[PDB]
Protein backbone atom coordinates (compact mmCIF):
# COMPACT_ATOMS: atom_id res chain seq x y z
CA UNK A 1 0.00 0.00 0.00
CA UNK A 2 1.13 3.85 -0.38
CA UNK A 3 3.22 5.48 2.39
CA UNK A 4 3.46 8.82 2.10
CA UNK A 5 6.37 10.73 3.88
CA UNK A 6 6.23 14.57 3.38
CA UNK A 7 8.63 16.87 5.10
CA UNK A 8 8.79 20.53 4.95
CA UNK A 9 11.16 21.52 7.84
CA UNK A 10 13.49 23.94 8.10
CA UNK A 11 17.32 24.34 9.72
CA UNK A 12 17.23 20.29 11.49
CA UNK A 13 20.30 18.49 13.31
CA UNK A 14 20.48 15.12 14.13
CA UNK A 15 22.23 12.76 16.28
CA UNK A 16 22.09 9.26 15.94
CA UNK A 17 24.32 6.67 18.29
CA UNK A 18 26.34 7.92 20.76
CA UNK A 19 28.65 6.38 23.14
CA UNK A 20 30.75 7.81 25.61
CA UNK A 21 33.29 5.47 28.25
CA UNK A 22 36.51 6.77 30.30
CA UNK A 23 38.98 4.89 32.85
CA UNK A 24 37.53 1.72 31.47
CA UNK A 25 39.86 -1.53 31.73
CA UNK A 26 38.48 -3.64 29.11
CA UNK A 27 36.13 -1.66 26.00
CA UNK A 28 33.50 -3.56 24.34
CA UNK A 29 31.37 -1.89 21.76
CA UNK A 30 29.05 -3.33 18.91
CA UNK A 31 26.62 -1.14 16.90
CA UNK A 32 24.89 -1.65 13.70
CA UNK A 33 22.31 -4.21 12.50
CA UNK A 34 19.29 -1.55 11.21
CA UNK A 35 20.71 1.96 12.19
CA UNK A 36 19.14 4.42 10.01
CA UNK A 37 19.46 7.94 11.95
CA UNK A 38 18.23 10.54 9.22
CA UNK A 39 16.78 14.06 9.36
CA UNK A 40 13.54 12.65 7.29
CA UNK A 41 15.09 9.01 8.12
CA UNK A 42 12.78 6.08 7.09
CA UNK A 43 12.74 2.38 7.40
CA UNK A 44 10.24 -0.39 5.87
CA UNK A 45 10.26 -3.92 5.91
CA UNK A 46 13.62 -4.28 7.42
CA UNK A 47 12.73 -7.91 7.76
CA UNK A 48 10.54 -10.13 5.04
CA UNK A 49 11.85 -13.50 5.45
CA UNK A 50 12.79 -16.25 7.66
CA UNK A 51 16.10 -13.83 8.48
CA UNK A 52 17.56 -12.47 11.33
CA UNK A 53 19.55 -9.13 11.95
CA UNK A 54 20.96 -10.10 15.58
CA UNK A 55 23.45 -7.78 16.46
CA UNK A 56 24.22 -9.68 19.23
CA UNK A 57 27.69 -9.56 20.47
CA UNK A 58 27.77 -12.50 23.11
CA UNK A 59 31.06 -11.20 25.54
CA UNK A 60 31.87 -14.82 26.64
CA UNK A 61 35.23 -14.69 29.20
CA UNK B 1 -3.94 0.79 3.54
CA UNK B 2 -2.58 4.32 3.08
CA UNK B 3 -0.43 5.88 5.64
CA UNK B 4 0.06 9.50 5.18
CA UNK B 5 2.80 11.55 7.14
CA UNK B 6 3.16 15.26 7.12
CA UNK B 7 5.46 17.56 8.67
CA UNK B 8 6.04 21.41 8.50
CA UNK B 9 8.44 21.92 11.51
CA UNK B 10 10.56 24.42 12.06
CA UNK B 11 14.16 24.33 13.88
CA UNK B 12 14.21 20.65 15.03
CA UNK B 13 16.71 19.03 17.12
CA UNK B 14 17.01 15.18 18.00
CA UNK B 15 19.45 13.18 20.03
CA UNK B 16 18.56 9.37 19.60
CA UNK B 17 20.70 6.39 22.35
CA UNK B 18 22.74 8.00 23.98
CA UNK B 19 25.34 6.24 26.94
CA UNK B 20 27.92 7.15 29.11
CA UNK B 21 29.79 5.55 32.00
CA UNK B 22 32.70 6.31 34.37
CA UNK B 23 35.53 4.93 36.75
CA UNK B 24 33.85 1.10 35.45
CA UNK B 25 36.03 -1.29 35.18
CA UNK B 26 34.63 -3.64 32.31
CA UNK B 27 32.41 -2.21 29.41
CA UNK B 28 30.11 -3.56 27.57
CA UNK B 29 28.02 -1.55 24.72
CA UNK B 30 25.66 -2.84 22.44
CA UNK B 31 23.22 -1.37 20.16
CA UNK B 32 21.15 -1.62 17.31
CA UNK B 33 18.48 -3.92 16.20
CA UNK B 34 16.59 -1.39 14.38
CA UNK B 35 16.84 1.97 15.49
CA UNK B 36 15.77 4.87 13.63
CA UNK B 37 16.04 8.37 15.10
CA UNK B 38 14.78 10.97 12.71
CA UNK B 39 13.41 14.40 12.52
CA UNK B 40 10.50 12.80 10.86
CA UNK B 41 11.52 9.06 11.73
CA UNK B 42 9.09 6.36 10.47
CA UNK B 43 9.20 2.42 10.56
CA UNK B 44 6.66 -0.06 9.22
CA UNK B 45 6.73 -3.67 9.25
CA UNK B 46 10.29 -4.33 10.56
CA UNK B 47 8.96 -8.06 10.78
CA UNK B 48 6.63 -9.54 8.30
CA UNK B 49 7.71 -13.03 8.81
CA UNK B 50 9.37 -15.97 11.04
CA UNK B 51 12.22 -13.67 11.78
CA UNK B 52 13.89 -11.83 14.91
CA UNK B 53 16.03 -8.60 15.43
CA UNK B 54 17.25 -9.86 18.98
CA UNK B 55 20.07 -7.86 19.86
CA UNK B 56 20.67 -9.55 22.79
CA UNK B 57 24.11 -9.69 24.13
CA UNK B 58 24.33 -12.73 26.13
CA UNK B 59 26.82 -11.70 28.87
CA UNK B 60 27.91 -15.08 30.51
CA UNK B 61 30.89 -14.67 31.74
CA UNK C 1 -7.17 1.45 7.02
CA UNK C 2 -6.10 4.79 6.37
CA UNK C 3 -3.53 6.54 9.08
CA UNK C 4 -3.29 10.27 8.84
CA UNK C 5 -0.14 12.27 10.94
CA UNK C 6 -0.30 15.83 10.57
CA UNK C 7 2.05 17.89 12.69
CA UNK C 8 2.48 21.56 12.43
CA UNK C 9 4.94 22.08 15.12
CA UNK C 10 7.81 25.09 15.45
CA UNK C 11 10.79 24.44 17.27
CA UNK C 12 11.08 20.90 18.90
CA UNK C 13 13.30 19.39 20.76
CA UNK C 14 13.35 15.27 21.37
CA UNK C 15 15.80 13.24 23.58
CA UNK C 16 15.24 9.61 23.62
CA UNK C 17 17.16 7.06 25.42
CA UNK C 18 19.53 7.93 27.59
CA UNK C 19 21.58 6.12 30.20
CA UNK C 20 24.30 7.02 32.71
CA UNK C 21 26.43 5.48 35.03
CA UNK C 22 29.25 6.05 37.75
CA UNK C 23 32.02 4.20 39.56
CA UNK C 24 30.75 1.20 38.40
CA UNK C 25 32.48 -1.94 38.60
CA UNK C 26 30.93 -4.13 35.87
CA UNK C 27 28.76 -2.13 33.14
CA UNK C 28 26.42 -3.92 30.27
CA UNK C 29 24.53 -1.74 28.31
CA UNK C 30 21.83 -3.08 25.77
CA UNK C 31 19.59 -1.12 24.03
CA UNK C 32 17.38 -1.63 20.34
CA UNK C 33 14.81 -4.13 19.25
CA UNK C 34 12.80 -0.89 18.28
CA UNK C 35 13.69 2.20 19.29
CA UNK C 36 12.24 5.01 17.31
CA UNK C 37 12.35 8.54 18.96
CA UNK C 38 11.54 10.91 16.32
CA UNK C 39 9.94 14.73 16.01
CA UNK C 40 7.04 12.93 14.13
CA UNK C 41 7.80 9.44 15.47
CA UNK C 42 5.70 6.69 14.20
CA UNK C 43 5.65 2.73 14.29
CA UNK C 44 3.31 0.81 12.55
CA UNK C 45 3.26 -2.78 12.76
CA UNK C 46 6.35 -4.00 14.57
CA UNK C 47 5.72 -7.44 13.99
CA UNK C 48 3.78 -9.05 11.69
CA UNK C 49 3.93 -12.62 11.86
CA UNK C 50 4.87 -15.27 14.12
CA UNK C 51 8.60 -13.53 14.85
CA UNK C 52 9.94 -12.03 17.75
CA UNK C 53 12.21 -8.59 18.72
CA UNK C 54 13.06 -9.53 22.38
CA UNK C 55 16.31 -7.20 22.72
CA UNK C 56 16.91 -9.69 25.95
CA UNK C 57 20.36 -9.49 27.63
CA UNK C 58 20.29 -12.90 29.33
CA UNK C 59 23.51 -11.74 31.84
CA UNK C 60 23.96 -15.03 33.73
CA UNK C 61 27.19 -15.08 35.49
CA UNK D 1 25.72 60.78 31.85
CA UNK D 2 25.56 57.33 31.16
CA UNK D 3 22.55 55.83 29.08
CA UNK D 4 22.23 52.46 29.51
CA UNK D 5 19.59 50.29 26.98
CA UNK D 6 19.82 46.43 27.18
CA UNK D 7 17.05 44.65 25.86
CA UNK D 8 16.98 40.60 25.19
CA UNK D 9 13.84 39.98 23.59
CA UNK D 10 12.27 37.74 21.47
CA UNK D 11 9.68 37.65 18.55
CA UNK D 12 8.97 41.18 19.04
CA UNK D 13 6.30 43.06 16.67
CA UNK D 14 5.66 47.06 15.72
CA UNK D 15 3.77 49.07 14.23
CA UNK D 16 4.36 53.33 14.24
CA UNK D 17 1.82 55.61 12.88
CA UNK D 18 -0.52 54.49 10.93
CA UNK D 19 -3.43 56.72 8.75
CA UNK D 20 -6.64 55.19 7.74
CA UNK D 21 -9.41 57.21 5.64
CA UNK D 22 -12.70 56.65 3.58
CA UNK D 23 -15.22 58.62 1.54
CA UNK D 24 -13.22 61.87 2.52
CA UNK D 25 -13.46 64.88 -0.50
CA UNK D 26 -9.89 66.11 0.49
CA UNK D 27 -7.57 64.61 2.50
CA UNK D 28 -4.00 66.18 3.59
CA UNK D 29 -1.65 64.05 5.73
CA UNK D 30 1.33 65.22 7.54
CA UNK D 31 3.65 63.21 9.58
CA UNK D 32 7.34 63.20 10.27
CA UNK D 33 9.00 65.43 13.06
CA UNK D 34 10.89 62.86 15.11
CA UNK D 35 9.63 60.01 14.51
CA UNK D 36 11.47 56.78 15.12
CA UNK D 37 9.19 53.65 15.63
CA UNK D 38 12.13 50.54 16.48
CA UNK D 39 11.57 47.31 18.04
CA UNK D 40 14.60 48.81 20.26
CA UNK D 41 13.78 52.90 19.96
CA UNK D 42 15.99 55.20 21.10
CA UNK D 43 15.92 59.38 21.12
CA UNK D 44 17.99 61.36 23.26
CA UNK D 45 18.42 65.18 22.86
CA UNK D 46 16.22 65.77 20.17
CA UNK D 47 16.88 69.87 20.44
CA UNK D 48 19.90 71.07 22.11
CA UNK D 49 19.52 75.15 20.78
CA UNK D 50 17.35 77.66 19.74
CA UNK D 51 16.23 75.27 17.38
CA UNK D 52 12.39 73.66 16.08
CA UNK D 53 11.09 70.70 14.99
CA UNK D 54 7.77 72.05 14.05
CA UNK D 55 5.62 69.93 12.09
CA UNK D 56 2.51 71.97 11.62
CA UNK D 57 1.15 72.19 8.39
CA UNK D 58 -1.08 75.13 8.20
CA UNK D 59 -3.75 74.13 6.37
CA UNK D 60 -5.30 77.56 5.66
CA UNK D 61 -8.02 77.74 3.27
CA UNK E 1 28.54 61.17 27.37
CA UNK E 2 28.08 57.30 26.62
CA UNK E 3 24.93 55.89 25.15
CA UNK E 4 25.32 51.89 25.13
CA UNK E 5 22.56 50.14 23.06
CA UNK E 6 22.58 46.48 23.28
CA UNK E 7 20.23 44.36 21.82
CA UNK E 8 19.91 40.63 21.36
CA UNK E 9 16.33 39.76 19.86
CA UNK E 10 15.82 37.02 17.44
CA UNK E 11 12.33 37.35 14.60
CA UNK E 12 11.64 41.55 14.98
CA UNK E 13 9.34 42.55 12.30
CA UNK E 14 8.92 46.50 12.25
CA UNK E 15 6.40 48.71 10.25
CA UNK E 16 7.23 52.75 10.11
CA UNK E 17 4.87 54.81 8.75
CA UNK E 18 1.42 54.40 6.93
CA UNK E 19 -0.64 55.88 4.93
CA UNK E 20 -4.05 55.08 3.48
CA UNK E 21 -6.48 56.54 1.86
CA UNK E 22 -9.95 55.77 -0.75
CA UNK E 23 -12.69 57.64 -3.00
CA UNK E 24 -10.92 60.76 -1.78
CA UNK E 25 -11.29 63.82 -4.38
CA UNK E 26 -7.32 65.83 -3.77
CA UNK E 27 -4.54 63.62 -2.07
CA UNK E 28 -1.81 65.50 -0.64
CA UNK E 29 0.61 63.41 1.44
CA UNK E 30 4.32 64.72 2.91
CA UNK E 31 6.48 62.77 4.57
CA UNK E 32 9.77 62.65 6.33
CA UNK E 33 11.55 65.28 8.42
CA UNK E 34 13.35 62.68 10.67
CA UNK E 35 11.44 59.50 10.09
CA UNK E 36 14.04 56.55 11.58
CA UNK E 37 12.58 53.61 11.54
CA UNK E 38 14.25 50.46 12.45
CA UNK E 39 14.87 47.48 14.33
CA UNK E 40 17.51 48.36 16.66
CA UNK E 41 16.37 52.56 15.76
CA UNK E 42 18.43 55.08 17.21
CA UNK E 43 18.63 59.14 16.92
CA UNK E 44 20.21 60.99 18.75
CA UNK E 45 21.23 65.12 18.59
CA UNK E 46 18.45 66.11 15.74
CA UNK E 47 19.21 69.45 15.99
CA UNK E 48 22.06 70.75 17.43
CA UNK E 49 22.22 74.27 16.66
CA UNK E 50 19.54 77.22 15.09
CA UNK E 51 17.94 75.28 12.35
CA UNK E 52 14.48 73.87 11.88
CA UNK E 53 13.42 70.26 10.52
CA UNK E 54 10.08 71.62 9.80
CA UNK E 55 8.08 68.85 7.61
CA UNK E 56 5.43 71.40 7.29
CA UNK E 57 3.31 71.04 4.20
CA UNK E 58 1.36 74.69 3.94
CA UNK E 59 -1.94 73.77 2.54
CA UNK E 60 -3.10 77.41 0.86
CA UNK E 61 -5.56 76.82 -1.14
CA UNK F 1 31.32 61.26 23.37
CA UNK F 2 30.89 57.52 22.87
CA UNK F 3 27.43 55.65 20.73
CA UNK F 4 28.08 52.04 20.91
CA UNK F 5 24.91 50.39 19.47
CA UNK F 6 25.44 46.22 18.84
CA UNK F 7 23.02 43.95 17.75
CA UNK F 8 22.73 40.19 16.82
CA UNK F 9 18.98 39.42 16.01
CA UNK F 10 18.12 36.96 13.40
CA UNK F 11 15.32 37.10 10.92
CA UNK F 12 14.60 40.90 10.86
CA UNK F 13 11.94 42.46 8.52
CA UNK F 14 11.63 46.58 7.91
CA UNK F 15 9.36 48.60 6.28
CA UNK F 16 9.99 52.25 6.31
CA UNK F 17 7.53 54.78 4.63
CA UNK F 18 4.50 53.46 2.62
CA UNK F 19 1.76 55.55 1.17
CA UNK F 20 -1.52 54.05 -0.90
CA UNK F 21 -4.00 56.16 -2.27
CA UNK F 22 -7.10 55.20 -4.73
CA UNK F 23 -9.85 56.83 -6.98
CA UNK F 24 -7.95 59.93 -5.72
CA UNK F 25 -8.58 63.16 -8.34
CA UNK F 26 -5.32 64.46 -7.66
CA UNK F 27 -2.50 63.01 -6.04
CA UNK F 28 0.32 64.54 -4.65
CA UNK F 29 3.28 62.91 -2.96
CA UNK F 30 6.74 64.16 -1.02
CA UNK F 31 8.98 62.24 1.15
CA UNK F 32 12.35 62.52 2.16
CA UNK F 33 14.21 65.17 4.52
CA UNK F 34 16.12 62.34 6.49
CA UNK F 35 14.22 59.19 6.12
CA UNK F 36 16.80 56.49 7.47
CA UNK F 37 14.60 52.93 7.13
CA UNK F 38 17.33 50.69 8.35
CA UNK F 39 17.25 46.86 10.34
CA UNK F 40 20.36 48.41 12.32
CA UNK F 41 19.21 52.33 11.49
CA UNK F 42 20.99 55.09 13.44
CA UNK F 43 20.67 58.62 13.09
CA UNK F 44 23.07 61.13 14.50
CA UNK F 45 23.31 65.36 14.79
CA UNK F 46 21.01 65.75 11.39
CA UNK F 47 21.45 69.19 11.39
CA UNK F 48 24.64 70.82 13.24
CA UNK F 49 24.34 74.23 11.81
CA UNK F 50 21.56 77.33 11.50
CA UNK F 51 20.21 74.81 7.95
CA UNK F 52 17.26 73.72 7.65
CA UNK F 53 15.98 69.97 6.49
CA UNK F 54 12.09 70.96 5.64
CA UNK F 55 10.66 68.95 3.56
CA UNK F 56 7.39 71.38 3.03
CA UNK F 57 5.42 70.78 0.35
CA UNK F 58 3.70 74.21 -0.43
CA UNK F 59 0.66 73.02 -2.22
CA UNK F 60 -0.91 76.64 -3.40
CA UNK F 61 -3.64 75.92 -5.57
Given at each position: ?????????????????????????????????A????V??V???????????????????
Amino acid sequence: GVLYVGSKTKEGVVHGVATVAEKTKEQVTNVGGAVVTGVTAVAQKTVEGAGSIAAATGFVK
